[PDB]
Structure formats: C-alpha cells, structure tokens
Ligand binder design. Sequence first.
Ligand SMILES: CN1CCN(C(=O)Nc2ccc(F)cc2)CC1
Length: 460
Amino acid sequence: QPEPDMITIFIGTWNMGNAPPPKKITSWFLSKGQGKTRDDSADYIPHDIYVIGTQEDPLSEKEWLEILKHSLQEITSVTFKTVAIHTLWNIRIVVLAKPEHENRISHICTDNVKTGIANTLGNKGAVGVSFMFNGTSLGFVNSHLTSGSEKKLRRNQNYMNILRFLALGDKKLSPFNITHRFTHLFWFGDLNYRVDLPTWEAETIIQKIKQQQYADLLSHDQLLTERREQKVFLHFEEEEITFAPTYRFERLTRDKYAYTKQKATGMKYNLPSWCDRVLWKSYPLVHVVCQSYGSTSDIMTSDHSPVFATFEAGVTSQFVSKNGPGTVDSQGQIEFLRCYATLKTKSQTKFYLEFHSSCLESFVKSQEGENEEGSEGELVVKFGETLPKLKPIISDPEYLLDQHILISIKSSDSDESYGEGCIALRLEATETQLPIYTPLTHHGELTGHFQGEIKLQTSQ
Ligand SMILES: CN1CCN(C(=O)Nc2ccc(F)cc2)CC1
C-alpha cells in the first residue's frame, strides 16, 4: 500500500451564534452553496483530513463529535477517527481523519491562547492543533478575534498574541513561532474583520449583495486592506472571495441581513461583512492548491453562515536509509555561501545564525557575522564563506530536495531572535551555486531579509 504524496484537507469555520445546529449540515462538508464550490461528481470521495473550527459553540464536545462523525459517515460511508478536539470557552477545533491515516499521524499537539486583558479577557482567543502526517508537519488555528467595525487594530493585536503564544509543533524549534513550524499552516475562524463603509450605506451594500456584485465591498474589507498594508497575516494566502458576506443574518432565513444597532449588539451596527475566513501559509515550493472556498446557503440556525475551504496539500513519506536516521549520510551536504542578513534593527550587537531542519540531527549555530552599514541606514550582517557546512541525515535527492532549512538570526548579547525565515531545498540544480532568499520576521512582523547562495550535494 503506497504512501501518499498528496492529501486533501477540509477546513470549516462556523460561528454557531450559541444555537444548536439544524439536523442536516452535510452541505458544509460537501462545499456546496455560494463561492468556489466542489463538483457534484466528488461528493462520495472523502477528504483525508477534516478540520472543523467553531465559535459561539453551545454543544458539548461529545454532542458535536456525534453530529460531525454521523454527518461524514452519511456522506462517505466512512467512520472517521478523532485525531484531536480542543475547546477554549465556546471556541472549538475538531480534527477527523480517514481510518487508513491512523498510523500515519503522530505528535498530536493542542493549545489555546486567550486574548485581551481584564475587560477584554474572557471570551476571545484561539485554539489549535498540530501533528505530523508521515514526513509533513500540519498546523491548524481556529481564532475568534475581537468584534466591532472600529476594532481592526485590536484584531491585528489578537493575531500577533495568538502567533506568539500558541505552543504547537516541535518545541525544539525554539526561535520559531507557529508561522514557521509547519509545512502547511491553516488559520481560520471568525476573524471579525468588517466591510468599512458608512452606516448610511447599509441598504446600498445589501443591494450590491443581492446582485452578487462583491468588488466594491471587497475593496473595503478590513482583512484585505490590512493585509495589503502588511498590518496582519504577513506571508499568508487567501483564495478570492466569490460568496456573499457571511454575517450578520436574521436566523432561520438567509434573505435578510440584520445590520441595525440593537441593545443586544451594544448599540453597534453590523454591516454585512466577511467575518468568517480561511487563510494558509505553506513552506516555499510545497504544493498547496485551494479547490473550494465558499459559504453554505441552507444552514440558518446562526447569524453567521458556515464557510468551507478545501485544499490539495503535498506530503512526503517517513524516509529511512541505510545511514540516517541515527547518523549523517556523508554523501550529502548543504553549503550557504556569500550570505548576508539585512536587518531593520538599530541595535549594535553581533549576530549569529541558527539553522534548524528535520534533515539535520540537531540545529547548527554559526560564528558571528560581520556588521556593516547599508547605504540607506540599515544593518547588513555578512557571513561570507564562514558558515558551517550542514550534514543532512539522508543524501538521497528524493528526500533532500523536499526539505527546508529554517534560519534564525540571533543577538550574541541576548540570544534572542531578531528574525526568522525559511529556505526550500527544492533547487533547480545540485552541486551548483544558486541564489536563495527569505524575508525575515519576528512576531510575524517584517524585520529584514536573508539572501545569498546555496550549493546542495545529494547522492546523485
Ligand atoms: C497522546 N496521545 C498519544 C496517542 N494518541 C493517538 O495516537 N491519537 C490518534 C488518533 C487518531 C488518529 F487518526 C491518529 C492518532 C492520542 C494522544
């Protein structure tokens, strides 16, 4: 039975509005409704992994697991295995997998982050799950961010707290936050970004939605504008939105948006918005293709509609050679040549690098680089040809060309990371000096760049 080189992943996000679901929710798992929808001919084909994020979820874990598993069984005739379930307050993530994947899945981690302080602590935050699928690390974050049209900056702060403090994946990757720990990271939820138009334009907005004319609304979507100004979700992707705003509906129909201020809303307007979103970030040159992104039309218990997204994701096998794991394979080497970091910092410490990769027995620390001034005010840290030659555990190009090297640049004075990035080993050539590049971030914000050349030796 061959190991897969591709899987499909279902991501669902639904703010349930503290109401039990209706008896049938199969349309959600089938990616049927509005937007980019799944072909009818696929309906019986199970996804490999289903990741369900809920917010304002009133059900027990048991109650929801029963509804989810019976739903999928009705669709596919497959009894899914529960990989993980984690709940913070009324924010929940469930991961289900086909039974054939049970002995492909390991290193299951769960965590949560509570956002805000005192007043603003006690209902918003995030839950997450990570695991290994054979040789591929997968991370999943379900976040319910701060509500309200005038709180986009709070949402951005919530995002940074979640990616700083959510403890998923390999704890040995100590300089790296969740935005660098996974081959594929999916981040979804009620992100609560709104369409930033005047309140007086509510009926105009509804008109546009009824005509399926989303362009002038999307140009005011706070998540798209904030992402374009690099305020949030730097280096994440989102499929094009081709479905109606998923909030705020009158319950038990989808024919009415309930946008007017009410005591129950704290006298806030809720103009129709795309609150409910799915974003991802995969390591460079790994296959990831969005195959659906849309909302259901027929699930109306909540003031939100469910959102679905599906993906093809490249995966690798758990590689064994005569040599590694358990030793290095002397036919393999990675050389980083003529590299330099360009940093936005004003600090005047020396810097060293750390190289982290599951193709190494353990992480590798460099010597200190040489600091110079850039022409436009910047710090440039030069490493020359001084960098340690990296010794991978397996030399086979079928393994090594699929790997990645995480880079941290750290202060000699404090050992703290000033920037993190990732380099793919999916090169155009081996035994050939080739340009490499990664932006560097810290707490998910741009802090600089790393560039240079690489020369990769494999057993071929
Ligand atoms: C800490 N433990 C280790 C064993 N364990 C597990 O193996 N779960 C699993 C479930 C479903 C699946 F598909 C694969 C693995 C539960 C957590």
